[PDB]
Amino acid sequence: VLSPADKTNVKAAWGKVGAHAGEYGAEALERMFLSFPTTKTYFPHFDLSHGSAQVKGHGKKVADALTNAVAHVDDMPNALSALSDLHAHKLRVDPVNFKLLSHCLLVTLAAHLPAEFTPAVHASLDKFLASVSTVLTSK
């Protein structure tokens, strides 16, 4: 899918997220845990209440992988390789759950990017997360 215009939009959004990526990663998760409670069973060992240090820390790892994806948009399969084996083989993550977190990541972005989340940027970001989700479910 990923067109130059989509790459341009995704980079623009990434620039405005800037150093808040970790924090947005945390927020996405909490959004997902509250909105889609079935997702919580993947994190029994987490305290998922607001301000949890484990959600904050996990948020940074998520954001780290997403910026890795942005930085290697042309070869995500190679980039996210290990992560796909982790989520499939070890963690048994139901693929439907990628759509849910993708949606929460979009919502988070919408809530923080007044100017940047235009209709075209929304489409480009959705396409971006759908590619990441395709890679993470490939195994």
Binding site: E27, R31, L34, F36, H103, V107, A110, P114, P119, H122
Partner: protein, 144 residues
Amino acid sequence: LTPEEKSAVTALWGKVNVDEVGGEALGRLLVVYPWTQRFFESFGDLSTPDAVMGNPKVKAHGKKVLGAFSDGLAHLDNLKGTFATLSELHCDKLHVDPENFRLLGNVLVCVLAHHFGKEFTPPVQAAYQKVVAGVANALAHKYH
């Protein structure tokens, strides 16, 4: 919905520009999920995002439909009555795949987050996700 959820939903919904949010939500569906254009052939130019968003028929359809779910004075704390007609329309007549009811709801939620920013808190979104799931299921009843 719990009283907490209805509260979150109605307090925010009071401040929605019904006119704008309907057109906004429909436009972004057409732009984000371009297969949905297939059902709005009569609307003319949907060629670019700018054309989609600026298209008079899109914004007018958005306003008509959402203008019937209020911004104060009842609607958006309903149950199960008007949806029967819309279910027959969307399923029996239009043959819209019901998945698209969830997507549009998700798009409305993105629109809300964009307009309300930090005020669209994770608890508030949660409450809006139940609504959009409730509406999606109602409209899909003629498939069930």
